[PDB]
Amino acid sequence: KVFGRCELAAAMKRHGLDNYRGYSLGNWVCAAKFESNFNTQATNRNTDGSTDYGILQINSRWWCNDGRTPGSRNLCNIPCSALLSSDITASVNCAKKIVSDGNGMNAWVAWRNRCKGTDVQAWIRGCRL
């Protein structure tokens, strides 16, 4: 599923990402835009043998089980396929663990490179939330 901007924004707000650990909804929409281009099926291989899955590109080394990542811990207790669902519930619940893991949104390398310190409020413009 490719989400529209305000479509994703509404869903992320319903699941409680707005101001979660002090990060405005715009940070989360911006992160999704550049991690996944709002495509819930986005997958990207990393060179440690791990893969990033879904709307928020959640990593298979610590967070979900894809059954093919060496030294994998599945801290979100879900298969990585569940993070490619058209609904974002699992991806949000798991992202709440990751943002609480001692680096805030710095865990998202597209967020860090393209969102952090920017006018993130722009990402919820025209959304009726």
Nearest to 35 by CA among 93, 95, 119, 124: 95
Kindly list the domain boundaries of the chain, sorted by start residue.
Answer: 1-129
Known binding residue 101? Answer is: yes
Nearest to 69 by CA among 87, 92, 52: 52
Residues linked to residue 51 through DSSP beta bridges, in sequence order: 45
Final resolution, Å? 1.8
The hierarchical CATH code for the domain 1-129 is: 1.10.530.10
Q: Are 98 and 10 in contact (CB under 8 A)?
A: no
Residues acting as catalytic residues: 35, 52
One-letter-per-residue 3-state SS of 27-61? HHHHHHHHHHCCECCCEEECCCCCEEECCCCEECC
Nearest to 120 by CA among 40, 23, 38, 54: 23
Residues linked to residue 59 through DSSP beta bridges, in sequence order: 52
